[PDB]
Amino acid sequence: SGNTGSIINNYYMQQYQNSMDTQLGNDWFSKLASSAFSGLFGALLA
Amino acid sequence: SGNTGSIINNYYMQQYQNSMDTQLGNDWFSKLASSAFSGLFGALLA
Amino acid sequence: RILTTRNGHTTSTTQSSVGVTYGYATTEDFVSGPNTSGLETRVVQAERFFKTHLFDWVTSDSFGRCHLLELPTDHKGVYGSLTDSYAYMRNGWDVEVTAVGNQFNGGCLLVAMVPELCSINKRELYQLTLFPHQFINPRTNMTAHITVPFVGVNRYDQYKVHKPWTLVVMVVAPLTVNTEGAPQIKVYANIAPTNVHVAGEFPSKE
Amino acid sequence: RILTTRNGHTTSTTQSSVGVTYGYATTEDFVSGPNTSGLETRVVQAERFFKTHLFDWVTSDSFGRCHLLELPTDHKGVYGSLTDSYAYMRNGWDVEVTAVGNQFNGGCLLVAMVPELCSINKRELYQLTLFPHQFINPRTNMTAHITVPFVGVNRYDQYKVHKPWTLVVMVVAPLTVNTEGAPQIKVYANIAPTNVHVAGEFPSKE
Amino acid sequence: FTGPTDAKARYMIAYAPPGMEPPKTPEAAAHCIHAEWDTGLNSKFTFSIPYLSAADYAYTASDTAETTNVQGWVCLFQITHGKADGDALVVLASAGKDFELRLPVDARTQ
Amino acid sequence: TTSAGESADPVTATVENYGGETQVQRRQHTDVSFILDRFVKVTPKDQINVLDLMQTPAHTLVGALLRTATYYFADLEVAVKHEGNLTWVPNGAPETALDNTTNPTAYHKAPLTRLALPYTAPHRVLATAYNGLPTSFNYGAIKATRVTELLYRMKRAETYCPRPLLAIHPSEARHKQKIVAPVK
Amino acid sequence: TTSAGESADPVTATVENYGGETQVQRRQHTDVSFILDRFVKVTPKDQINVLDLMQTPAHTLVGALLRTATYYFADLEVAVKHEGNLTWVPNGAPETALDNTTNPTAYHKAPLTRLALPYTAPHRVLATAYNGLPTSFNYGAIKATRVTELLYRMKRAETYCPRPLLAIHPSEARHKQKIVAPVK
Structure with missing residues (x-):
C-alpha cells in the first residue's frame, strides 16, 4: 500500500506486524475533486 | 535480458527494481542487416 | 446572455450577448474555382483573434461621427505574413466590437460591416442599417458580434491593392454621463478572419 | 535512372538517380505527445524545397575536407517564418545534393546526414559511412538523395538553441580533370523539410 | 471579480511561451494563446494554463545559478473598464485535471 | 469558464476550452501513504525519548506533509543508534517502567536497531493541532544509556482535514537554488 | 559480387560465391544489453558526485561502447566505497537536498554499498552528443563524507543512431601487445 515492494508474503502474522483495525456499526477530496465542474457555462460559438 | 542469470524470480516487485515504461499511441539495423543483397548480380557461368 | 466565441486557440467570453449577426450569408461560397487551377491552401493557423483600438467615445461627439477601419489591417502575426507570402487570398471576418462603460450611461452606437466603403455622405448614414450591423446600447449591452463572408467581383482578392470590407462605427445617440455613468467609453475591436485561403506564393527577399 | 521527387508545389527531376536512402526510419514517429497537450498544428505550406550553395570542389582539395551545414539554415520563406512565430517545431529532412561535372571527371564525394555533429575528428571521418549517406561519383551519378526523420532527446525541439541534423559533404577521392573533364564542380544542396509540426505561438513585435 | 454592480471590466489572460521576451501590450499578446472575458452575473472565470514544453516533465525550481525565465510567462492584461477605479480582482490557483508531480525530494524550509 | 466564484x-x-486535449496523469508520488513512508531524523535527547511525531522538524518533507493534516493515523517504525539496551514502553506507561527489561527491550547489535511499533494511543486518531502544545498523545517512549540517532517512519498513514503548506518566500521574483548539474 | 557501390x-x-559455405554464428557477446551490463570505475570527486555517464573514460569498454551511440536509455547501478552516510538525490534536485537524510540514504556497512537507481531524467532518452558539453541531464547526485571508489553499471541499455569507434593507431603495420601466455 505504502512504500513496500516485496512480492513474498510476510514471515510474521498480521496480528504482530501492524495494529488491527476495528469496524463500528481518498476519500472526501477524491469525491470533491471528481465532482469539479469542467465544461463551459454559456453558449459556445465557433 | 542483459547480464542476469538468476532462475529464481526477484524478491522485489517490478515497480521498485526498474523504471516502468510508458507506451504512446534490434531494431532498424537488424532489418537493415537482414535486407542485405547476398547473391550475384550477373549471369553465373560454371 | 452568456456567449463564448472561439477562433483557433483564442477565446472570447461575453455576458451581454444580444446575439450574432450573420451578414449576407451563413455559409461560405465555393472556394476552389477555375481561376487558380487547384493550387490553393487553407491556413488554419491564421484564423484567430487580433485586437485594435478603434476610437474613444465622449460626450462632445454628436450624431454621425464615424470611425472607418478597412479590413485587412496592419497585422504583425501569422495573417500579416500570409499577405507578404502569397499573391491571392480569401477570407470572411468575425468582428466583435466592445464599448465598456456601465449601465448608467446613455447613447447608442451602430457598428456595421460595409463592402467597399470608398465614399460616404452624411444623409446616407441614415441608411447605415442596410448593412450587417448591431447596436451597442450601454443600457443593455457592451458587445456586438458580426460574422460575414468574403465578397467581391473576383473569388480571390489581392489585399495590397484592394480592401473589400470596412468596419464603420457611428454615434446614433450621443454619450451621457448621468451621475453614476462613466466619463468616456474607449471602443475596442476584436477581429478574426475565417476560412482563409491563399494561392500564388511569392519569391523571397533573402 | 529517372526519378521525380516532389514537395508541395516544387518539383525536382533527376536522371542519375542511384536511389533514395532512407536513414534510421522510413516512417515518422508519434507526433501528438504528452508534452504539448494536443495544441499542435501541421503546416503544409512549409514542406517545399529551398536551395543552398554548399562549396566548390576543385583538384587541390585532398581527402577529408568537409563541409558542414547545420539544419535548419537561414531561411527567408514560410519555414523561416515558422521559427519566429512558434516555440516548438518538429520535422524530418529531404536532402538532395547535386555535384554537376561530366562523366570524364574522377573522384568521389560522400554526403551524409549526421545527428548532433558538434565535434568531428580526422580518423572518425573514416567511419562517416556509419551515418545515412550516399556517394557522388561523377563516373556514374551527379545526384544524391537522402530522406531522414526527426531525432532528439525531446519529441519537439526549439531550433533557435539546438540544431539536430548536420549535412556533411566529404571528399573521399580528389577531383581529376582528365582531358575532357570539367575544371571544377560547384556543389549545391536542395533541402525540403517533411512533416513539420509547430506548437506554442509567440507574441508579435507589432 | 469583487467590484460593485455599476463597475464593469474586461480582462485578458495570455500565455507567452519561452524563446523571446514577453509582450507588454494586449495587441501584442493577441497572437499568443489567450482568453478574454468580461464581468457580469457570473463572477469567476477559470483559465487553464497548458503544459507546453520540449520535455514531458519540467523542473520545479532552479538551483541558484542561471535560467532566464524558462517555461514562459503568465500575462494578465485588462482591456476596458467602466467605473472600476480601484476595485479588486482576486485570483486563486489550483492544479489541473492532468496535473502530475513526481520524484520526491527534501531540500529545506518546511 | 465563467461561474459563481463565491459559491466555493x-x-x-x-485546455480543451481553447482547443487542446487533456493528457493522462500518474499521481503515485503525491498520495499520502507513499510519501510519508520514509525515515526522517529527529534530534534525540540523551536518554529518554518520548516518541511523538511533533519532534519532526517542520521544514522537512515528512514534518511539513505531516503538519498538512489536522488528524492522522499511523503505525510507527523506529531506527535507533544507541549505547546499551534500548527499552520501549507504550502509551500511558510510567517512566520507571523504562527501567525494566520485561518491557520490549532490544539488545545492542551494531550498527543500529530497527523495530516496528504499533498504534498504542487511546484515541481513534491523533492530532497536529489541538485547541484546548497538544495533549499527551504519543507512541510511547524509549531509552538507552545514550541515544545518538533517532529515525521515524510512518506506515499505513491516513490523514484528515487538510491545513496549509507554506513554501519559502523569495526576496526577488523567483526563489533560485543551485540545482545539481555537471560542471562540464 | 558486383553492384552499384554509390547507392549505399x-x-x-x-564464401559461397567461390564454392564455400557460410557457417552458423553466435552473437550473444556483441548485443547492447549484455556488453554494457558490467561495472566500470570512474574517478570520483571528494564529496559531491554528479551521476552522469560521461564521467566514464572514453578508452574503457563501457565508455567507448556507450559513446558509440547518439542516444541511450538505461537504469543505473552504483557501487560506492565511502566514509559516512551516502546520500542520493534525483534529477532536478538542489544541492542542499544532498544534506538531508529523508532523501535515499544508505548507511555505512563494510566494504561497499551497492544500490539500484532508476531513470529520473525528464527526457525520453539521453544523449552522448548534443549540438546546442551537453545539457544538464544525468542520474541525480550522491555525496558522503568522502567517496573513494565509484562504479557504474548500465542495465536495460538501449542505443540509437550509432557513431564511430576508433581503435589505437599503430606505428608499424600491426599493433602488437603482450598477450598473456605461460613462460614455459
Missing part, C-alpha cells in the same frame, strides 16, 4: 464549488478548467 | 544499400558477399 470546485471548478476546474481544461 | 547494404551488400554482403559470402
